[PDB]
Recover the amino acids of this structure.
């Protein structure tokens, strides 16, 4: 298995130092510590004996200063919604939670620049800015629990990535605490600033291996005056792809989301979540969202788009909604897919970037490769961004079924020059499969960067670079 | 200011470079004069060797040799940079990407373009536009600037408001490191979270951490309808409300929002002989839209102009959907920088400030600078809070520089602004980062610099504090 690196252990003196550093922010009770040690998928559990919950950036700096001198490994944790085992300890690394770093520092109603602490939950940030007629540039099904610091640390994609793009573009500045406790202030709240290297980009997608994000500056797009969502049934994946091409051609700049899900996904969300399908039974379903400034113009685009899609046979049945209650219910069919799979049994999860034309080929293949040993096999995700979420469910974990999935799925993906982790990141699960998507020379530079910023390696060990 | 202890180019080095790049070794000093002079014509190197490699392997092999010999190398693209970064300070080897001008691939569905770093931006725009796509950036230097130079400086530009930074639109880079190591981050995927986003280090590194040789970039679709509204505003307060209503009334179709003052219009008319199409106003704004339905776009701006002219935000205006007239309106703005360098000596500052206070420094400097400056102008990317502040003088005067500096840099810091929003640092601003970056940030930049280029052969005297 994996072996524990020669870190120190948490002593009584360390617990006393943490109570001094974070008064009332030291949890050592083993039953309370059980939940933060187990990941969201509940397939990994650490043996951490202390979870620290600082309130301020200075406290985070001082904690790591103490941990750097004492050589104690630290596992930063936000909402603990990560999918790659990066959010929980492997052995006894101190859990540093951002749960109390949940304050908004400022929001400028003209520029739409938000400055807030890393532990602010994304949905509450969305409600804050939408009260001021702006929106967050990303949204995910984990919005209710995931923290913005975790989102930046994982470079979270999400459901509006098609419209607003990466956090690499939307993060304007970061405050980061490094492994030795130096608070690196790169918290520029400016749209444009070319005064040296864009150091904050290193920490976007680094997953707490190069430093702990404590404050985030984010560009909030304006809240759209008109939001429409269309939910369509397609008779095949070829029609889904041409529907997407027609979608870009006819809706254009107002398109804010394009998601797909197969029939089995719809069945699972119907079975486990009791959500009736709003369309005719189809092999594939598509969720399109539009955001724009003129409701009348957006209605014309979508109407003419829909007229052509049904007329040319790309869509068999579809429905549309503008009412906020109904719009959210259609989104629920997509956002809650992840919940229904993990409740269906053991989930074999694969998050792949592939050529959009070949996005679903692996799902048909794995249904053929995997006999009755797979309970269900589903494919869905962000088709507009080339993102497939490949999931296999079974009654329980099987080494035989794992051997059929791996390395086959990773070799398939590499054959398409694709990404084995499009969005969710590397963490513990995918640390040894980066060669499928990254060349050795790139991986070495990541290691040299790690040694520069965290030479003792106390920040998220066993993560997220190869051994 | 003083030359670092690099080796000097020997006769054996020129023979070695001829083996590596046959026919790519230019040593004629008169031909070497133009690449030695920056675009602003205020920095001049004394380099005796210009190298024009064709392939990434030729760049790797040149730098392995340069790494062995500790010879300084000055990467160069279109030589349109504004911060003295693109020319040697002393005798650095100029490595031009002029011949690295091949498109490697373009997928007509995803719109992802992979091309060599030396491809000129305007030529690439024509190429992807022949396939109904566009570059995610465009600059006034489009006719000369290289995509490798654009990525190395993290160029913002005139459509930054719509498509954003190269940090978002660049998908992958192949970079040759100081020791010749070829770093392959040339992924053509929209989303890829397999480790650190190493390419981001080189976006804005200005050739100090490596030489970008191949670029992968997401090209947005070419819009079906481009409209340009050129309006005259009676004050900067009216400019700001024209911008605010614009976002509310045009919204997602908005692709550019530029502003310029009256003095800017006078210099482009005087030096470039371009006539204004609207009545004389103290401020002009250029609004561009890009959308998929030409009809919906036309209706959105018509309602916007009717309200803008109705509410007194605009006094006179013109509009064009014709490709010819759209370029004529755009020509008045893109080459203002050309019209400024032709007015005399130009003191140039590229500032990010709160948009509401963006022009306050222009009024301040005009009051502070009496008759001792020729003109003080303010223009640039108002949508991005990016002010191009320029002061002209009949000749350079150390008096006028002492009046402007550090005052201009201190003013911006008082606003928590950027002392180089767009153009970068280079040679001129290497010692002005304290106004925008704290010491801990600047310290880490040197640590990354020491890791990626321990000998410091790549772009010496750049772009970090001394
Ligand atoms: C229902 C559901 C839907 C999801 N949908 C999406 C989706 O659409 N797109 C997508 O990309 N992902 C998605 N995810 C996974 C995604 O990675 C997480 O939801 C989220 O982005 C991580 O935030 P978090 O606060 O939960 O971080 P955690 O899970 O707590 O941590 C994840 C990693 O980040 C590190 N980290 C956390 N906080 C910090 C910090 N302050 N500083 C430094 N490092 C830190 C941790 O050490 C760990 O390595 C989904 C997950 C769920 C459960
Ligand atoms: C008329 C005009 C308008 C402009 N408008 C804008 C604008 O709107 N926005 C904006 O941001 N800038 C603007 N610029 C300046 C802009 O920074 C440059 O024009 C351009 O982005 C750089 O390309 P280049 O080929 O000229 O690079 P160069 O000038 O040759 O070099 C620029 C710097 O990057 C380095 N470099 C160049 N190529 C490479 C490479 N392949 N690999 C590594 N390092 C490299 C050089 O060493 C140097 O430090 C304008 C310039 C002009 C003359
Ligand atoms: O699909 C999954 O199981 C993981 C979450 C995914 O990012 C989503 O888009 O919902
Ligand atoms: O204006 C300047 O001094 C330099 C060029 C500038 O980036 C522009 O937007 O035209
Ligand atoms: Zn997803
Ligand atoms: Zn500019």
């Amino acid at each position: 298995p994996v072996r524990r690196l020669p870190f120190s252990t948490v002593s009584k003196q360390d617990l006393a130092a943490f109570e001094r550093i974070v008064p009332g922010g030291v949890v050592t009770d083993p039953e309370a510590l059980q939940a933060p040690n187990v990941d969201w998928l509940r397939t990994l559990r650490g043996c951490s004996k202390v979870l620290l919950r600082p309130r301020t950036s200075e406290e985070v700096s001082h904690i790591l200063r103490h941990c750097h001198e004492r050589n104690l490994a630290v596992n930063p944790q936000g909402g603990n919604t990560g999918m790659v085992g990066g959010s929980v300890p492997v052995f006894d690394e101190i859990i540093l939670s951002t749960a109390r770093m949940n304050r908004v520092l400022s929001f400028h109603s003209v520029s739409g620049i938000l400055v807030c602490q890393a532990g602010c939950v994304l949905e509450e940030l969305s409600r804050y800015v939408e009260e001021r007629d702006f929106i967050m540039p990303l949204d995910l099904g984990a919005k209710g629990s995931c923290h913005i610091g975790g989102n930046v640390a994982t470079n979270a994609g999400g459901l509006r990535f098609l419209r607003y793009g990466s956090l690499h573009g939307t993060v304007l500045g970061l405050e980061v605490v490094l492994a030795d406790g130096t608070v690196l202030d790169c918290l520029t709240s400016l749209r444009k600033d070319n005064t040296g290297y864009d150091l904050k980009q290193l920490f976007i997608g680094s997953e707490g291996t190069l430093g702990i994000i404590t404050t985030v500056s984010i560009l909030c797009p304006p809240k759209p005056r008109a939001v429409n969502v269309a939910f369509l049934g397609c008779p095949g994946f070829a029609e889904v792809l041409q529907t997407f091409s027609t979608c870009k051609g006819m809706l254009g700049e107002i398109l804010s989301a394009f998601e797909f899900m197969d029939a089995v996904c719809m069945q699972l969300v119907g079975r486990h979540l009791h959500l009736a399908s709003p369309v005719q039974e189809s092999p594939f379903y598509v969720l399109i969202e539009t955001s724009g400034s003129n409701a009348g113009h957006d209605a014309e685009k979508l109407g003419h788009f829909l007229e052509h899609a049904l007329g040319s046979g790309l869509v068999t049945d579809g429905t549309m909604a503008t009412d906020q209650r109904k719009v959210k219910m259609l989104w629920a069919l997509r956002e809650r897919i992840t919940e229904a799979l993990s409740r269906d049994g053991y989930v074999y999860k694969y998050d792949l970037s592939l050529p959009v034309e070949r996005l679903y080929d692996i799902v048909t293949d794995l249904r053929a490769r995997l006999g009755p040993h797979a309970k269900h096999v589903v494919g869905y995700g962000h088709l507009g961004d080339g993102n497939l979420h490949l999931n296999v469910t079974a009654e329980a974990f099987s080494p035989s079924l794992l051997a059929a999935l791996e390395p086959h799925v990773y070799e398939w993906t590499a054959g398409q020059q694709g990404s084995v982790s499009a969005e969710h990141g590397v963490g513990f699960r995918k640390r040894d499969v980066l060669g499928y998507s990254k060349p050795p020379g790139a991986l070495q530079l990541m290691q040299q960067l790690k040694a520069l910023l965290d030479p003792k390696g106390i920040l998220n060990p066993y993560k997220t670079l190869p051994s």
About this structure: The radius of gyration of chain A is 23 Å.
